[PDB]
Design an enzyme around this catalytic site. Sequence first.
Site, mmCIF file in Angstrom:
data_model
loop_
_atom_site.group_PDB
_atom_site.id
_atom_site.type_symbol
_atom_site.label_atom_id
_atom_site.label_comp_id
_atom_site.label_asym_id
_atom_site.label_seq_id
_atom_site.Cartn_x
_atom_site.Cartn_y
_atom_site.Cartn_z
ATOM 1 N N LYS A 7 -14.580 39.214 54.651
ATOM 2 C CA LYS A 7 -13.146 39.361 54.344
ATOM 3 C C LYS A 7 -12.253 38.904 55.494
ATOM 4 O O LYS A 7 -11.194 38.258 55.288
ATOM 5 C CB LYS A 7 -12.855 40.846 53.959
ATOM 6 C CG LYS A 7 -11.408 41.079 53.530
ATOM 7 C CD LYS A 7 -11.185 42.488 53.037
ATOM 8 C CE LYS A 7 -9.912 42.540 52.198
ATOM 9 N NZ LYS A 7 -9.418 43.906 51.852
ATOM 10 N N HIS A 12 -8.296 35.383 57.540
ATOM 11 C CA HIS A 12 -7.749 35.052 58.832
ATOM 12 C C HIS A 12 -8.251 33.823 59.508
ATOM 13 O O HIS A 12 -7.629 33.406 60.483
ATOM 14 C CB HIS A 12 -7.896 36.240 59.776
ATOM 15 C CG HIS A 12 -7.206 37.462 59.257
ATOM 16 N ND1 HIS A 12 -5.864 37.480 58.977
ATOM 17 C CD2 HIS A 12 -7.674 38.681 58.909
ATOM 18 C CE1 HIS A 12 -5.526 38.668 58.501
ATOM 19 N NE2 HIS A 12 -6.610 39.408 58.442
ATOM 20 N N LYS A 41 0.273 39.201 48.847
ATOM 21 C CA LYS A 41 0.102 39.805 50.184
ATOM 22 C C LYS A 41 1.329 39.461 51.112
ATOM 23 O O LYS A 41 1.656 38.287 51.289
ATOM 24 C CB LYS A 41 -1.221 39.420 50.857
ATOM 25 C CG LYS A 41 -1.414 40.073 52.229
ATOM 26 C CD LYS A 41 -2.787 39.837 52.850
ATOM 27 C CE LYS A 41 -2.996 40.781 54.024
ATOM 28 N NZ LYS A 41 -3.811 40.286 55.133
ATOM 29 N N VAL A 43 2.306 39.750 54.510
ATOM 30 C CA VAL A 43 2.205 39.192 55.817
ATOM 31 C C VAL A 43 0.725 38.920 56.082
ATOM 32 O O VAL A 43 -0.109 39.797 55.879
ATOM 33 C CB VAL A 43 2.702 40.146 56.880
ATOM 34 C CG1 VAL A 43 2.584 39.494 58.268
ATOM 35 C CG2 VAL A 43 4.160 40.561 56.603
ATOM 36 N N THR A 45 -1.846 36.435 58.917
ATOM 37 C CA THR A 45 -1.992 35.456 59.948
ATOM 38 C C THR A 45 -3.325 34.706 59.819
ATOM 39 O O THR A 45 -4.368 35.307 59.537
ATOM 40 C CB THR A 45 -1.947 36.172 61.278
ATOM 41 O OG1 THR A 45 -0.690 36.827 61.360
ATOM 42 C CG2 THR A 45 -2.078 35.153 62.427
ATOM 43 N N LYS A 66 -3.924 49.737 66.435
ATOM 44 C CA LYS A 66 -2.750 50.390 65.849
ATOM 45 C C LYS A 66 -3.113 51.700 65.215
ATOM 46 O O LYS A 66 -2.394 52.657 65.342
ATOM 47 C CB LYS A 66 -2.105 49.497 64.774
ATOM 48 C CG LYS A 66 -1.165 48.465 65.322
ATOM 49 C CD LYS A 66 -0.695 47.462 64.263
ATOM 50 C CE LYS A 66 0.117 46.334 64.885
ATOM 51 N NZ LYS A 66 1.553 46.675 65.134
ATOM 52 N N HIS A 119 -10.901 43.312 61.399
ATOM 53 C CA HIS A 119 -9.471 43.485 61.065
ATOM 54 C C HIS A 119 -8.677 42.637 62.053
ATOM 55 O O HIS A 119 -9.053 42.497 63.232
ATOM 56 C CB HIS A 119 -8.969 44.978 61.129
ATOM 57 C CG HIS A 119 -9.556 45.897 60.086
ATOM 58 N ND1 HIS A 119 -9.206 45.848 58.740
ATOM 59 C CD2 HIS A 119 -10.388 46.965 60.211
ATOM 60 C CE1 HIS A 119 -9.844 46.789 58.089
ATOM 61 N NE2 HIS A 119 -10.561 47.485 58.953
ATOM 62 N N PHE A 120 -7.608 42.047 61.554
ATOM 63 C CA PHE A 120 -6.578 41.433 62.364
ATOM 64 C C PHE A 120 -5.508 42.508 62.644
ATOM 65 O O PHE A 120 -4.776 42.923 61.721
ATOM 66 C CB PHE A 120 -5.969 40.255 61.661
ATOM 67 C CG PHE A 120 -5.154 39.416 62.565
ATOM 68 C CD1 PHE A 120 -5.724 38.384 63.289
ATOM 69 C CD2 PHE A 120 -3.813 39.675 62.728
ATOM 70 C CE1 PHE A 120 -4.965 37.620 64.191
ATOM 71 C CE2 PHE A 120 -3.061 38.891 63.585
ATOM 72 C CZ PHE A 120 -3.631 37.883 64.319
ATOM 73 N N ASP A 121 -5.398 42.920 63.902
ATOM 74 C CA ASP A 121 -4.460 43.999 64.278
ATOM 75 C C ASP A 121 -3.052 43.536 64.587
ATOM 76 O O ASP A 121 -2.080 44.137 64.115
ATOM 77 C CB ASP A 121 -5.034 44.798 65.407
ATOM 78 C CG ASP A 121 -4.552 46.276 65.405
ATOM 79 O OD1 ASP A 121 -4.757 47.002 64.438
ATOM 80 O OD2 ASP A 121 -4.059 46.708 66.417
HETATM 81 PT PT LIG Z 1 -12.052 49.113 59.089
#
Ligand SMILES: [Pt+2]
EC number: 4.6.1.18
Length: 124
Positions: A7, A12, A41, A43, A45, A66, A119-121
Amino acid sequence: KETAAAKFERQHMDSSTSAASSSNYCNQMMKSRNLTKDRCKPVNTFVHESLADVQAVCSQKNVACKNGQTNCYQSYSTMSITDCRETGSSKYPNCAYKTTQANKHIIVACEGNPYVPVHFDASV
Ligand SMILES: [Pt+2]
Ligand SMILES: [Pt+2]
């Protein structure tokens, strides 16, 4: 079922070209990555570095995420990214994005074995 690492690559990673030229990059990319299917979706990146460079972030600067977990990492270098952000007038099913090119550090959450981004933070 899609893994968290898969994912992350689908949402990303865009290793094919070093930038976003077309103002319609986000409209096109958001669609082909399945991020306009059910809802728009808002936002997202895309990172335009090699997968190897992005996976290496998991051995760079450890920072909090975050959400308060501490398995996030900031890229030592700036990376070529595109920010896609939905326009104010965008309404599903006609999703509309503004496309913005940038060179910034990325922050990703890493997990699993191999220990890779899930994850993209944020970008900084
Ligand atoms: Pt997670
Ligand atoms: Pt910097």
